Amino acid sequence: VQSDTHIFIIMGASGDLAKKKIYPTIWWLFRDGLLPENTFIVGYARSRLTVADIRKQSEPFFKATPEEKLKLEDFFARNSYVAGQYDDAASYQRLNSHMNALHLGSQANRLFYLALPPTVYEAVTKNIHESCMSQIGWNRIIVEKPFGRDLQSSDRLSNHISSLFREDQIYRIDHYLGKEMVQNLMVLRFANRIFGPIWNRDNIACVILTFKEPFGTEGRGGYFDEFGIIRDVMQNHLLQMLCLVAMEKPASTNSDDVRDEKVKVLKCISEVQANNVVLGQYVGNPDGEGEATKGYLDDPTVPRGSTTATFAAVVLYVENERWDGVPFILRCGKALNERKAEVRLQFHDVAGDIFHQQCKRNELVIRVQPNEAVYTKMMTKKPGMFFNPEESELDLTYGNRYKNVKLPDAYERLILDVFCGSQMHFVRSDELREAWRIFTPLLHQIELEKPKPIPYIYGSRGPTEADELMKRVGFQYEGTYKWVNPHKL
Amino acid sequence: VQSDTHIFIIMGASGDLAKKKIYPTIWWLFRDGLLPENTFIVGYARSRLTVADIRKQSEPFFKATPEEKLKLEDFFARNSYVAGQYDDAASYQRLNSHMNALHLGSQANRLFYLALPPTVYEAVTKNIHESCMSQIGWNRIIVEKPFGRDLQSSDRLSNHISSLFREDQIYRIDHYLGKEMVQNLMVLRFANRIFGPIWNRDNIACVILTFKEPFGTEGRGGYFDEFGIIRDVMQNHLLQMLCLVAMEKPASTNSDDVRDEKVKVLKCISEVQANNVVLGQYVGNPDGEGEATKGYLDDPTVPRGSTTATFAAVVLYVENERWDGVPFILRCGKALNERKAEVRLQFHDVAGDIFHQQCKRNELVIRVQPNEAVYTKMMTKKPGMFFNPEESELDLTYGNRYKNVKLPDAYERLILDVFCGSQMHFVRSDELREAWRIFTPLLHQIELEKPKPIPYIYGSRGPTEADELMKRVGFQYEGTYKWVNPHKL
Ligand SMILES: NC(=O)c1ccc[n+]([C@@H]2O[C@H](COP(=O)([O-])OP(=O)(O)OC[C@H]3O[C@@H](n4cnc5c(N)ncnc54)[C@H](OP(=O)(O)O)[C@@H]3O)[C@@H](O)[C@H]2O)c1
Ligand SMILES: NC(=O)c1ccc[n+]([C@@H]2O[C@H](COP(=O)([O-])OP(=O)(O)OC[C@H]3O[C@@H](n4cnc5c(N)ncnc54)[C@H](OP(=O)(O)O)[C@@H]3O)[C@@H](O)[C@H]2O)c1
Ligand SMILES: NC(=O)c1ccc[n+]([C@@H]2O[C@H](COP(=O)([O-])OP(=O)(O)OC[C@H]3O[C@@H](n4cnc5c(N)ncnc54)[C@H](OP(=O)(O)O)[C@@H]3O)[C@@H](O)[C@H]2O)c1
Ligand SMILES: NC(=O)c1ccc[n+]([C@@H]2O[C@H](COP(=O)([O-])OP(=O)(O)OC[C@H]3O[C@@H](n4cnc5c(N)ncnc54)[C@H](OP(=O)(O)O)[C@@H]3O)[C@@H](O)[C@H]2O)c1
Known part of the structure; x- marks a missing residue:
């Protein structure tokens, strides 16, 4: 009888995976009524874009139909963009106050998707835990391969992240x-x-x-x-x-x-x-x-x-x-x-x-x-x-x-799992x-x-x-x- | 490099099973080249028919095609009929000398199909063993249900036949x-x-x-x-x-x-x-x-x-x-x-x-x-x-x-088995x-x-x-x- 606010932060938003797969995927779950009623998509990248550019570059991958017009309008209204660098403290302060300013954004469950190259993984996960973590709702990070190049190098990263987040907050894809x-x-x-x-x-x-x-x-x-x-x-x-x-x-x-x-x-x-x-x-x-x-x-x-x-x-x-x-x-x-x-x-x-x-x-x-x-x-x-x-x-x-x-895409399944807190299909x-x-x-x-x-x-x-x-x-x-x-x- | 003569004796020939199933079945194996090259069909019944009547009454069940004309002519040339009663000694003497008069009919393998009611089973099996058995080739009898109405009554028949024929000569269907x-x-x-x-x-x-x-x-x-x-x-x-x-x-x-x-x-x-x-x-x-x-x-x-x-x-x-x-x-x-x-x-x-x-x-x-x-x-x-x-x-x-x-009929399979001496599909x-x-x-x-x-x-x-x-x-x-x-x- 009562539902929490949810925020889908797309880090590295401006990239191809984000425009070709992540944006288009989260719309599909939205469209098909699979996400929690109070859900907000937040884009975070260094480029200086507007929700209009994000839409213009992705909408061609949404596979939208004319009857979806309203849904699409509402999907974009629940969208916002915050420009910033990946290791600039100030930047993570803007992004954080950006989410609390969201309808019940201090209590909202935060999902951070790392649509970024492997070379920022440390700077980003560090900065997220330091300044962008909700003191109330849950915080789950989604990560992409590569997770290291060998044991030793995957160990560094693995223990860096594990130093900031518990297993129940880590979703390896x-x-x-x-x-x-x-x-x-x-x-x-x-x-x-x-x-x-x-x-x-x-x-x-x-x-x-x-x-x-x-x-x-x-x-x-x-x-x-x-x-x-x-x-x-x-x-x-x-x-x-x-x-x-x-x-x-x-x-x-x-x-x-x-x-x-x-x-x-x-x-x-x-x-x-x-x-x-x-x-x-x-x-x-x-x-x-x-x-x-x-x-x-x-x-x-x-x-x-x-x-x-x-x-x-x-x-x-x-x-x-x-x-x-x-x-x-x-x-x-x-x-x-x-x-x-x-x-x-x-x-x-x-x-x-x-x-x-x-x-x-x-x-x-x-x-x-x-x-x-x-x-x-x-x-x-x-x-x-x-x-x-x-x-x-x-x-x-x-x-x-x-x-x-x-039959849905693997990304539709995996992202829904994260919202629902199921981890059996994550490494x-x-x-x-x-x-x-x-x-x-x-x-x-x-x-x-x-x-x-x-x-x-x-x-x-x-x-x-x-x-x-x-x-x-x-x-x-x-x-x-x-x-x-x-x-x- | 050398093949024996075979004789398919259809007892009770004149009946419906014989006209609707046995005659039509043996043609199909003939037609499809499944039988031994020197094969003769012999009909035995009390009625006084000619190979022409036997053909006229059965040919409508053969499912013949025009290209099969020759084969059909040859199938009927290899056909003959011998009238007689089921327990008349004289009758079984005519039927026996009828087969030896067949190309190498004294050495031929004889197959007797009992297309008859259960009430002649004793008289027929008795008379066959007594006068119609080849002293050279093999003798196999094929029988139809019913084989008795209960243990005791199926025992009588079973031990009567077993008294004249060995298991390897009995084909129960x-x-x-x-x-x-x-x-x-x-x-x-x-x-x-x-x-x-x-x-x-x-x-x-x-x-x-x-x-x-x-x-x-x-x-x-x-x-x-x-x-x-x-x-x-x-x-x-x-x-x-x-x-x-x-x-x-x-x-x-x-x-x-x-x-x-x-x-x-x-x-x-x-x-x-x-x-x-x-x-x-x-x-x-x-x-x-x-x-x-x-x-x-x-x-x-x-x-x-x-x-x-x-x-x-x-x-x-x-x-x-x-x-x-x-x-x-x-x-x-x-x-x-x-x-x-x-x-x-x-x-x-x-x-x-x-x-x-x-x-x-x-x-x-x-x-x-x-x-x-x-x-x-x-x-x-x-x-x-x-x-x-x-x-x-x-x-x-x-x-x-x-x-x-x-896919063939069960009767096509079963009759071929008999010619080939396989008994796994007989009771x-x-x-x-x-x-x-x-x-x-x-x-x-x-x-x-x-x-x-x-x-x-x-x-x-x-x-x-x-x-x-x-x-x-x-x-x-x-x-x-x-x-x-x-x-x-
Ligand atoms: N698509 C794939 O085949 C694929 C497959 C599986 C997993 N994934 C994972 O998800 C990620 C998808 O992102 P992507 O493939 O689209 O990568 P990408 O295009 O190179 O960059 C993604 C975003 O990160 C920023 N970026 C790229 N290189 C950077 C650099 N050297 N320094 C700082 N910022 C940089 C860019 O934003 P700014 O310019 O605004 O900084 C860009 O918007 C991949 O890295 C991969 O690890 C991808
Ligand atoms: N449900 C279906 O739609 C359906 C159902 C049944 C069968 N089929 C089809 O029918 C075809 C046959 O099925 P199948 O591929 O499972 O069985 P198969 O042809 O007997 O092949 C056996 C497996 O051994 C491999 N192989 C091929 N040549 C070989 C060689 N010279 N030495 C060693 N291994 C070799 C093949 O691997 P690779 O070919 O993978 O390299 C194959 O998977 C397949 O193309 C399949 O698509 C489809
Ligand atoms: N068709 C079935 O449903 C069926 C199914 C499974 C097994 N079979 C077995 O194979 C047999 C097939 O023959 P059928 O069903 O066609 O039987 P049927 O028509 O009654 O008679 C078959 C032949 O036996 C003779 N006959 C019949 N009743 C006789 C009697 N009371 N006394 C003396 N001779 C008699 C008739 O010849 P004459 O008048 O020239 O003597 C007739 O040509 C059956 O008895 C059955 O046991 C049949
Ligand atoms: N390869 C094929 O062509 C193919 C493949 C798969 C399925 N199918 C078909 O799909 C349909 C379903 O298959 P199925 O018949 O195997 O499974 P099913 O419908 O689940 O039936 C289970 C069995 O229980 C019996 N049954 C029905 N009502 C019952 C009741 N109230 N209480 C107790 N037992 C009851 C039925 O027997 P009876 O109905 O025999 O009396 C049936 O064989 C079938 O009609 C079948 O033809 C066909």
Whole structure:
């Protein structure tokens, strides 16, 4: 019967993430009535803008409709901008008195989004806690990757922030956690007797965690050159997915227990081993149709003779009862053959074969994107006047089963969570350090040795070696699976 | 490099099963090149017909095409008819010398199909063994239900035939064994790690085996009145399906081991208990659209005041390690709400619930007919801005996944088996007696007590009581499952 004032402070407001993703996202939650009734958006950046510029530059990303006119007017009335520098005490004084001057702004819950480069993280978090914290409502900070470049460097930042804010005030973002299917992992796993007594090392051969993009560096490879693919996609997104697949059942669905089960899994993995690694970097394709005839080193923005790899495949192992000996294959790449983020389980051969080496390993597949789907590869009998078993599947395809239902962006989910104080889809500090300690020794190693990557053509599935690493750990491919979309249901 | 002569003797040739199903079936195997090159069809009946009459009365069931003209000419050239009585020694002498006069007819393998009423079974099997058996090739007899009316009466016949023929010469028919999906049970179960470690009493709540027809007695209820629904559909088809679901993994896929695993299951079931039974007999529907306004007792062919039931539901139990305490619900009926033959597994609730009593029991469904399909009911998460788990499914629907593929009749499968000497889809003598010993005490009981059936309207799902019996043993229904066929795959 009574609602508190809320203030969404967009720091670094003037940037592209803010104009292309943050502003447009907070409108959508506003538009769809998902935010608290008394909500105010506050922009903070060094540039000297007016709510009119902020609107003019973002409104083209809002995807607005004419019937939304009023809502839009009211969304902008609840908007304000405060110019200032990121480490100027005076500046943070203006921003603070700016919020208390807001309807019940002294009691309001304050949410600070850091739509800024990593180089201000310390100055900003310091200044916020010092002068911009509400003495009444709650204060939650949202942060973006990168969170350090290795253990040691992620430790500095991590302990700086932890020195000012408690875990319950820190929201580290891995947008994969805001993904529909990635969130469905826990429902598939702990809601189904059918997917439970089978989630062990007695039944699973290997686990594969893939992420592919069909595009190369695309202009700005000079930025990628500095961090790489491991730090980019493997050390977080893929590793996050590993945690959700290998995690023990939580005491509950809450942040505490969920995230406790994840780091617990992580603390059981050893520093990735070089023999369990394959790095690639794409060359172009002379038969390619344009933009894909240029390879990594064909980006005049990328340093000449760059040894950086745009593709990596790694094999990890969870040294625990459930997953002892089951290899977890982390596989990501650019300039590949398609866009696809995926989780696959390949189960072990059945014991006591009675179909003459005709059966193939079962496989549960959770496709995160595109085209959300979950499907099992199982053995059925060749339909008709045949008795020989053949491969088929039991399928669940969003886009057909749930056409009406409209699916939100990971950022819409994640930002709503913050307002509601749910933290299960945000990276904990310990979860963070376990992740860096696993991949650091390797990253450093690549940094001191110029292991020249494995050439692979803009479009392929990567280096042949990557498939040989999978096969070697237990993953067997046959190429016999035949699939045909449907018709006339 | 060398092929033996084969003779398909159709006894009782002149009948409807022979004209509507046997003649038309053997042509189809002929047409599709499935039979041995030197194959001859021999018709034997009391009526005095010519291969021309046999053709004229059956050809309208052949589903022939104009391009099949030659094949048809050759199929009829390989046809002959021999008139005779069923117990006249002279008659069997003509029939025998008739076959040796056939190209290598003294060495030919002889297949005798008993397209006759049960009342000649003794006279015919006796006479066949006495005078019509090949001293060189093999002799296999095919028999149709009914095989007795109870244990004692099925025992007489069974030991009469067993006195003349060895098990390897006896092919008892349950056409369900010739059904695509019924045959797929063993591939689903023993080819899939996903459907194996879950097939126990620790994971399964109950098993349901349904068979429905949307039609009533339809004219000839005077025939049904004599045998009932239990003897008709339950004591064989449903019970056969029970065996395939509850059966241990066989040492091999061969007749010996497969059928050994089935009777083994049967010898672990106790005489069905009256408290575990619900009988119904349909009344009509005044709102019904014609033919379904008349009930069972509205068939002037059915005895006035018939207590016979046209619907029964029974609960059995396999007293063995795997299925201890799991009720097997056998459910069949007429004048019901649809045509459907089905196998369902309802699994047990998950242990350590973390979704607040929101989860529902998983269910694996194998639909034998119509529209061949296998689908699992599992818990997925409400797509979109929701976290509450909801029911969905992983589906396999023949008709969409395998449209091209053309599916044969159970009789096409079963007859081919006989030619090839495979017996796994034919009822063994012991398998037979175990089945009668389970249902006999009940059948008799119904025979001495006029338990008036449970009235139910032509169209419903049966008597409400039937659902109350299921619920009482463990099967829980909720009515929350929502399903929508597809589009735009
Ligand atoms: N978009 C991405 O791919 C992406 C992806 C994931 C996470 N994020 C995180 O969210 C941030 C999004 O912001 P952005 O990507 O849009 O960065 P950005 O464009 O470089 O700058 C964002 C804002 O910060 C200020 N700024 C930039 N460089 C600065 C510098 N060297 N010194 C002082 N102020 C500086 C600019 O405002 P003033 O000129 O007014 O100072 C600008 O309005 C990223 O840094 C990233 O960490 C981004
Ligand atoms: N629900 C759905 O919409 C649906 C349902 C069922 C199937 N399908 C489709 O049907 C096709 C087949 O499905 P599938 O991809 O899951 O099974 P699959 O073709 O048998 O492939 C097995 C996996 O091994 C990888 N692989 C390919 N070539 C290899 C090689 N030479 N050596 C080693 N590993 C190799 C592939 O990885 P990558 O290809 O990922 O690199 C693939 O994921 C897919 O394209 C899929 O989209 C779709
Ligand atoms: N169609 C069904 O629903 C069905 C289903 C499953 C199994 N089957 C089995 O296969 C058989 C199919 O034959 P049917 O159903 O077509 O039976 P049917 O029409 O009564 O007679 C079949 C043949 O046997 C002869 N016959 C019939 N009654 C006789 C009697 N009282 N004494 C002597 N000969 C007699 C007739 O030939 P003559 O006049 O030349 O002697 C007729 O050509 C059934 O008996 C059944 O056991 C049938
Ligand atoms: N692959 C496919 O084509 C496909 C896939 C998925 C679902 N579907 C369809 O979607 C619909 C739902 O599937 P479903 O039938 O498997 O699940 P369901 O509707 O949840 O029904 C559960 C089972 O309990 C029975 N039942 C109904 N009312 C009851 C009551 N009041 N008390 C006790 N038991 C009761 C039903 O038996 P009976 O109805 O058999 O008497 C039904 O088989 C079905 O019509 C099905 O055809 C089709």
